[PDB]
Design a protein around this ligand. Structure first.
Ligand SMILES: C[C@H](CS)C(=O)N1CCC[C@H]1C(=O)O
Ligand SMILES: [Zn+2]
Ligand SMILES: [Zn+2]
Length: 231
């Protein structure tokens, strides 16, 4: 069910949702896949996360221009690493309004990232303050607590079965939590649980570095976060 387009891969998840996948091409490591989302909200398109690079991200825009051919209203990027924010310059050159967690925008420079144009803020219960996320359509944005990073945010897609965990969640068969250099190892477990609780009906869990999975990815991630906390 995948379709290669250039160095990119696209996979339809529902009538109006597609997974985009890009691969890091650096002379020192293997072809590391990153997943993001494309959502057709009626007469416009919404993007969750860039690709690794500007060119890869423009390649995303081209696939959208070709296969959907509606204007891209906005993008939301889900934390200040390269696999999520590596392509901001491309989104800006294309006139696309960009959003990130305020904390993500604050960390951007230290991380080598260009900041998003607009900053999301969040209630104590983790739900986005609606005024900071205007006209987000079916995108339901939830900050689950520090985990994979301090800033990681998550997105549910109204009207579908899908919730996007970003790099916070790994699939049910993953061996480890991956690079934990930026990780809050104390809150990770609770933050994964908070994600699953925020989207309790979502049956397809989409993540950054595994194929879509069921809810078992959430509990599996939480357990692995608990095992690590206990050492
Ligand atoms: C550079 C990316 C940002 S999330 C990363 O840390 N990754 C990509 C896949 C897993 C993990 C790793 O390198 O160990
Ligand atoms: Zn990351
Ligand atoms: Zn990642």
């Amino acid at each position: 069910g995948d379709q290669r387009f250039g160095d990119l891969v696209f996979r339809q998840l529902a009538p109006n949702v597609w997974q985009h996948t890009s691969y890091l091409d650096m002379p020192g490591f293997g072809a590391v896949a990153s997943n993001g989302l494309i959502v057709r909200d009626g007469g416009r398109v919404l993007v969750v996360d860039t690709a690794w690079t500007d060119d890869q991200t423009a390649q995303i825009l081209n696939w959208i221009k070709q296969e959907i051919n509606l204007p891209v209203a906005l993008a939301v990027v889900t934390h200040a690493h390269q696999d999520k924010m590596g392509g901001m310059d491309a989104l800006h050159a294309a006139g696309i309004a960009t959003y990130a967690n305020a904390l993500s925008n604050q960390l951007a420079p230290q991380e080598g990232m260009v900041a998003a144009q607009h900053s999301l803020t969040f209630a104590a219960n983790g739900w986005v303050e609606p005024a900071t996320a205007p006209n987000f359509g079916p995108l339901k944005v939830f900050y689950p607590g520090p985990g994979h990073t301090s800033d990681n945010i998550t997105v549910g897609i109204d009207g579908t079965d899908i919730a996007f965990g970003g790099c916070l969640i790994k699939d049910s068969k993953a061996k480890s939590l991956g690079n934990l250099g930026d990780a809050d190892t104390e809150h990770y477990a609770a933050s994964a649980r908070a994600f699953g609780a925020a989207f309790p009906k979502a049956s397809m869990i989409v993540m950054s570095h595994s194929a879509p999975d069921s809810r078992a990815a959430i509990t599996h991630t939480a357990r692995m976060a608990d095992k690590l906390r206990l050492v």
